[PDB]
Symmetry: D2
């Protein structure tokens, strides 16, 4: 029921990115600061249900921060990116938004899904 | 010039011409981002002279790519208003290529050399 | 209605929509000859998915290949593609796992990953 | 000086894919058949120079086979893709075509470059 979802895939190992800290932020429309909305941790399928509610899902500029450095380092390995932040604009509120992350130690990618 | 880049428009298979890229380094005591360079990609999607050897020290760097402005100049929207790639430099004798493959609704990066 | 142990998802990365009505053809390699036997011909639904790719009766360890009619998908949209088709060739080891093998495609790039 | 080039990038280790075999074919429009053009092995920098000469680089459908299974096995690890074939159409002969491969053990991607 969260209108915003995510999926973290460990591309190097071909398994879900489990136990990754994710932080969701929305741009404050007065200060130009990022306000924290949620912190979450991906489950064993690399997902994080409950990121936002329908009511709090308003048009805005959002930021999802993936704690890639802490993730890779609890697997005992270095990462080129200490974290990854994906910034994106939500204009149409009646759509579902899936903002996933494909990660190795030295690359990543993302796409918009529905 | 130890740090370089390449922007490729994956939707069109053309270089990402005319894109503003701004480079910063994190102040390791304040957690502020010190700007180093503002550059603009050339016809071949590259941006030479991002930094000098005299200025390229170990630390955390951020490259902000102005993807929203770039797509807007081509007459189209982008899901991302900007893209920031943040990365750790531990060894200064190395060359770091930090490119960007972009479409309107996706992007990808890899450490290259 | 049973669930195929092999599935896919085609995503049109350029337009940020599912890749719908793309023909996919699943083959398996005979490891004694080098013949590719066609198993299945599907077409992606409106969510870019293709259920029922294979039944357990045919789902054994081996080398498989999925061909995605990318030039055909793009042409039916009035645009060219760099790649006339794309083929993803992959090894199945553990017959008791699910394998998701999706495709993220524009006119000039594509990528795949082992989904779970 | 070849109008067709490639670059193989090991995405999981953030380094060049060295010593990977690449086989280049072109479809013969008269027969229904692929014709072998050359075979190379990527260097240190993950590249494979001189795949084809200007004279031989005619319009047509081409195919590049990257021996991914043999590359990972030689490096002591398993892959999910035992080979990778990229088939592509060359319609403008005066352009340069860069066809790279970014590869891990469970993911890969390609793009057309210039």
């Amino acid at each position: 029921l969260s209108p915003l979802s995510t999926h973290v895939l460990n591309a190097a190992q071909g398994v879900p990115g489990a136990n990754m800290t994710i932080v969701l932020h929305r741009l404050d429309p007065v200060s130009s600061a990022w306000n924290i909305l949620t912190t979450g941790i991906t489950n064993d399928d690399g997902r994080c249900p409950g990121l936002i509610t329908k009511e709090n899902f308003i048009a805005g500029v959002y930021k999802m921060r993936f704690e890639t450095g802490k993730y890779w380092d609890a697997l005992g390995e270095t990462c080129f990116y200490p974290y990854v932040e994906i910034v994106f604009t939500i204009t149409n509120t009646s759509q579902h938004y899936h903002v996933p992350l494909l990660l190795s130690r030295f690359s990543y990618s993302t796409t918009r899904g529905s």
